[PDB]
RNA sequence: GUUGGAUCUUGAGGGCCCGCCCCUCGGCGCCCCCUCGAUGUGUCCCGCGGGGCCCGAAGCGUUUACUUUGAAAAAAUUAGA
């Protein structure tokens, strides 16, 4: 029952009203029944991207995500059809552990590994962008201006589902961190 | 070389000829293969540099001949990593 | 090498190179320009001004100058089959 | 470039590269000539890239072209296979031919039997013409050298890969480099190839 | 092992500029290595650099320019209370007209110029000119 | 840097950059650990378990399958080798020289290597005494060498 | 002895500058109290007054080295008006 999709204390409506009404239909959808009946997303976010489309960011604390990640190619494309071209993405959201510093208060820390740091969660977003292509390697191109354009070396197979979403996935992570991302299929297994 | 080159993306032969821990991107090329030998009635996943026997129950005692390098095969088979 | 804004201290400006980003100095031997004629653009009968490229002896004594002007005459043009 | 079409190798050239055997090279590992190698034969004999031959055949000619004199272009052939060729190069281009020994000191040596004032040197083999290449390096002289896959490359400016040793690969390039300059500056103008065959060229082969 | 991850990298790039080489494979890639690379990138001694992400320790390929003459390390490091900084500009920099000394200071890794502008030192890293 | 060993070569493998290995058949935690717990019942070292996890199964390692490694799984199980398995083979190396030294009072090679092997033990085992892996009150001994191997 | 691998997050003002991002004080609040504007042993604009508690803030949260701030740092000396 998509009833935590729209409520997270969140002011969305229409798209979270849509995604919940989508997910209820996705619950009522065959092959998509009984994996979304219990797994209802915690929050949704609709931003625009460099591909001119809107990007449904779907928030998952990842007990949810592993079935959302599991399909993600019909499930997005159905909602891309259901919401008229919108490149939906299923973005992980943890309770990201705070800065290791002093004041700018550091209320309680119990253990912060690199399994729970913020740069861990940024890279978890990058994986949840690309479900067909797996990040083989990464090359951050630190420009002479000081700018940095990461070259995400993806799987060179299953690459084409990413290619119409690259313009989205560059547009999404731009709005997330104030920083672009670039995706490559460079020479792996070739 | 004329000692002035920069290869941000070099040819994939000069890293691929190196040792697996001597690469520009140190990721091995040792891999899994799926054995089509008729000694078993099944297709069994075997690592390349397996170092050991890998057998089955559809076979009794041969699926592969072991090898500390890339593993010895019997009657010819297929092979797929897949995606390393 | 200059001083304060409009005032020039040095006796001259020594030449440079584009292959090692390194200067060509005072009396340096095998430290030469390379004047390659602008030949024109199927109409033919080469057009005057040679493309210049300064080469030092250091890239010459290290044997670099063959690919260096190949990084200067192919890369900048103009050359047929490139 | 000039007339770009015949400056992108014609089959008349392509056959002559095969006829003079220029595409072949030695068996030795390079680090400056391996770019100019197309492929290698079984257990190693290097097929050079005739693209790298022609594109250096153009530009090294273009270094000679727009020098208003071939007199300050001293072309060098200690190999007897190119001594007819530099005779027929100086017949065609008008450059200064150097046959045989350099006689160490024509570029140094105030008190000497000779003194030359070139601007660019053209060399059959920089190992066979290292004594030019020494006094090229002494008095700031750039030097074109025909280099095979075993040639030296120190102090060597723009290098045309050829087999350029023994065979008519020598006299073809002097046929071709005198072609390229008369292609640029001459009566074989507007980037037209020659009507003169490399039989006015290739070396004497003592006759009957 | 690599006791100094900078001095093993500075011997690389100095020998690279000795060869005129425009690429290096440096490792084990501390962030302290990276912050020195970013500053000298701003000063135009070098060009840009591109890190290749490895899970061993990561490696960087650096495109450099031939504008540098000497980059050295203070091995082992020392503390600078902004009063020794001029003597390193005396004994170790060729003039007081050019030459930059980089320091880790508690307002971040910076040059000697922002170190004098903020007046808060730290530990000395090295130099480049 | 190898003062523990005279080698200069390689004994260690390369590992790929991806944590999703092999991403064509990722046999689950239950696939690997029930194999592991049977192999922990069979009592192999993780060096031996991870080989037979690699080549026989469709997966390579459990650090790609799970977050834990085998000894980490064995620690989280609690059924784990009570000394480090690499250190166990280190102690195994010394007993084999010592018994051979107990055989040959003339093998001067066995007299020199048993120093360095135990010196490689005494620099390794000391570290595990510190971080509550070995008990620090315990100390390596030629008496305790054959005791741990047997 | 002496040295040692990687690795955890912070936009506006004006042509840099600011705080931010992924309780003991002050103090937005709360009630108590002399109550302040509805009300003049006392409310409901709120502790601003003391607070009390809990916030942005802060004992915060693992700390130092380090650096920086000052104090302190005989006179003479010495630098030097």
Helix proportion of chain A: 25-40%
- Report the major sheet of chain A: 3 strands, mixed
Based on secondary structure, the structural category of chain A is: alpha/beta
Strand content of chain A: 15-25%
The run of helices and strands of chain F is HHHHHHH
The CATH architecture name of the largest domain in chain F reads Orthogonal Bundle
How would you describe the oligomerization state of the chains in this entry? part of a larger assembly
Strand tally of chain A? 6
Shape of chain A: globular
Distance between the termini of chain F: 32 Å
Shape assignment of chain F: elongated
Number of strands of chain F: 0
The percent range for strand residues of chain F is under 5%
What is the count of DSSP helices of chain A, taking H or I runs of 4+ residues? 6
Number of helices of chain F: 7
SSE blueprint and pairings:
This is part of a larger assembly, with chains A (190 residues), B (84 residues), C (82 residues), D (208 residues), E (129 residues) and F (150 residues).
Chain B lengths: L31 E4 L8 E4 L37
Antiparallel strand pairs in B: 1-2
Chain C lengths: L35 E2 L12 E2 L5 H5 L3 H10 L8
Antiparallel strand pairs in C: 1-2
Chain F lengths: L28 H14 L3 H10 L6 H4 L4 H8 L7 H19 L4 H23 L11 H8 L1
Chain E binds one RNA strand of 81 nucleotides through β5.
PDB class: ribosome
Keywords: Translation initiation, 48S complex, capped mRNA, initiation factor 4B, start codon recognition, ribosome
Entry title: Human cap-dependent 48S pre-initiation complex
Task: Write up this protein.
This is part of a larger assembly, with chains A (190 residues), B (84 residues), C (82 residues), D (208 residues), E (129 residues) and F (150 residues). Chain A has one domain (1-190). Chain A contains six helices and six strands; from the N terminus they run H-E-E-H-H-E-H-E-E-H-H-E. Chain A has helices at 15-28, 65-71, 75-82, 118-129, 160-163, 166-177; strands at residues 43-48, 54-60, 89-92, 137-142, 148-153, 182-184. With 129 residues, chain E is of the alpha+beta class. Chain E folds into two domains: 1-68, Ribosomal Protein S8, Chain: A, domain 1; 69-129, Dna Ligase, domain 1, CATH 3.30.1490. Chain E is globular, with a radius of gyration of 14 Å. By secondary structure, chain F is mainly alpha-helical. Chain F contains seven helices and no strands. Chains in contact: A-B, A-E, A-F, B-C, B-E, B-F, C-D, C-E, E-F. The interface between C and D is large, with 40 and 42 residues. Strand 4 (137-142) of chain A pairs antiparallel with strand 2 of chain E. Chain E binds one RNA strand of 81 nucleotides through strand 5. The PDB classes it as ribosome.
